[PDB]
Subunit: 292 residues, 2 copies
């Protein structure tokens, strides 16, 4: 039984739930022992007072991890990246993940390689507001080539694709550009259409075991931030442990997010702690809808 | 019922369990929602590669927190690993500002003030050696009078009091000193006597509801393992039981200790405590270690 290594490289906040405040606890609560790298430490998602890791500090932590991993070819390495605020750090994270892969080189374990995965949540913005540089945007575009699974929201997809999304045809072309860049699975977590405001759509795409590409929509009804962060870390925990069919995994993840969402209306944050037994669950639905 | 605020000011590591990697999860898994300020981000307890907040960056976080409370909520500080003396003073200054801004100053409710606690775990060293900036020892001595509950190991007790502990009478002098400097509850988490090599002793002291000092000890069979952080586990569990469970503090200390011993017993394998695998016992509310008086 190869040894599980999950490395989660994201934001941390003094007050609230986002980046690694969600992911570190969801992982641990589900039986995992994640390595944690905090890219920033902010007062809260709203007051970005605090401290950022510069690229050299990222490289010092990550290089030490590559030192322990060299010659130690007995483990499955799983990177989950989210909020990185400057493109040098994004470049440095990418180089370090890349240098690890070079040393150690619809079921999810034949779409991608469970010995080594990079799951990139490309936290750049939402709904017209942008948290990073146009430099960070081009850094992810250079990194997509090396990413196993990318989980942008709709806005972030527009940024990496250079394509505004107004109807489903734009989504398909968007899924297409990211896939031909080398990403193995695209999930666009939420796309909202002008003509259906009560609902939002999650799309997922990938080549099948016959070199043919496949699309699926998930229709969900509607906000508190951090749903995307919950979604991503929940996705890796299902993939690496349960394994099996990705489209089943996604429904199961959606089952948990919705059920936590249902309790975080009385506030502004998600109720990560009040619903921790839900977060630790099986995911028991919204069934895939194929797209052409 | 008032809003609970727990603020854990400790270290963070990339790999392994110490400081806030323990306390955040312990707190969260027990249904609290700690605020979290990582004082350092190191690769591991043994590889202090990484970044350390300076005292201005500590003051940025905590002063923003003080602004949002200048109310109707109980405030519980837990401080642990802090490498830098000026960062220790800035934590002290800010905790005191919060005390100043609200005119602040065996059932635990009658021993301490559950409106506002500073539980100071003054991490400085162990087994004869020191692991902090050396001026940090002076900075924790400045803080003693301001601290409600202080939980040093033996060596840190010796540092704060200026005397070496070789016999029980030395433990009592140390408990007497720290209590008379104004701490409400002193807990020396382990003492190793050159004459009882198979056991560890934990001591607790305080003034009871009659303004008489009492001293209790817990005799722990020394399990011979290779992992640290049980002190961090001890202190966050202590706070959690104090603010949720309340009641008899000596009971609270027996329960914490049992949980700690059980985690250690399922962590004889490796070099880190097996927090995750033993998270369920950690979540709990088998008593092998029990208090005895010392007089
Ligand atoms: N109003 C809503 N009601 C219920 N579920 C929702 C709602 N909005 C989002 N979700 C769920 O939350 C998931 C995350 O969607 P999304 O809004 O793209 O995350 P995000 O936070 O914007 N991405 P990021 O912050 O960059 O990591 C979706 O896949 C839905 O399952
Ligand atoms: N070898 C051991 N056998 C049994 N219990 C132990 C052992 N070491 C520690 N403990 C328990 O853990 C508690 C905390 O240990 P202690 O060594 O006093 O904390 P610390 O030294 O500040 N932190 P650490 O770095 O983990 O040693 C003690 O009070 C005991 O309950
Ligand atoms: C600090 C920080 N980290 C992560 C996210 C993504 O939810 C956000 C924005 O929602 C954020 O502000
Ligand atoms: C960073 C850090 N945090 C906590 C501790 C002790 O639990 C140590 C001691 O080894 C440490 O180095
Ligand atoms: Mg946690
Ligand atoms: Mg997303
Ligand atoms: Mg301690």
């Amino acid at each position: 039984m190869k040894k599980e290594n999950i490395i989660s490289i994201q934001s941390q906040v003094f007050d609230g739930f986002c980046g690694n405040n969600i992911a570190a606890f969801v992982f641990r609560r589900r039986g995992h022992i994640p390595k944690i790298l905090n890219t920033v430490q902010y007062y809260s998602k709203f007051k970005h007072s605090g401290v950022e890791l510069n690229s050299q500090e990222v490289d010092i932590i990550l290089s030490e991890y590559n030192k322990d991993q060299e010659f130690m070819n007995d483990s499955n390495i799983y990177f989950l990246t989210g909020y990185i605020k400057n493109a040098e750090c994004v470049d440095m994270v990418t180089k370090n993940i890349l240098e690890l892969r070079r040393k150690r080189k619809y079921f999810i374990e034949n779409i991608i390689n469970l010995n080594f995965l990079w799951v990139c949540d490309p936290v750049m913005g939402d709904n017209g507001r942008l948290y990073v540089d146009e430099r960070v945007v081009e850094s992810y575009k250079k990194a997509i080539e090396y990413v196993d699974i990318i989980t942008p929201n709709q806005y972030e997809t527009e940024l990496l694709c250079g394509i505004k999304i107004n109807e489903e045809k734009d989504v398909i072309k968007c899924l297409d550009v990211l896939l031909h860049k080398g990403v193995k699975i695209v999930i666009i977590t939420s796309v909202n259409y002008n003509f259906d405001k009560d609902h939002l759509f999650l799309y997922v795409s990938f080549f099948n075991n016959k070199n043919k590409i496949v699309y699926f929509k998930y229709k969900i009804l509607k906000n508190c931030f951090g749903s995307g962060d919950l979604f991503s870390c929940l996705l890796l925990s299902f993939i690496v442990k349960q394994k099996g069919n990705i489209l089943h995994i996604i429904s199961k993840v959606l089952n948990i997010v919705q059920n936590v969402i249902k309790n975080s209306l009385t506030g502004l944050e998600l109720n990560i702690i009040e619903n921790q037994d839900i977060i630790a669950s099986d995911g028991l639905l919204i069934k895939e809808e194929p797209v052409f």
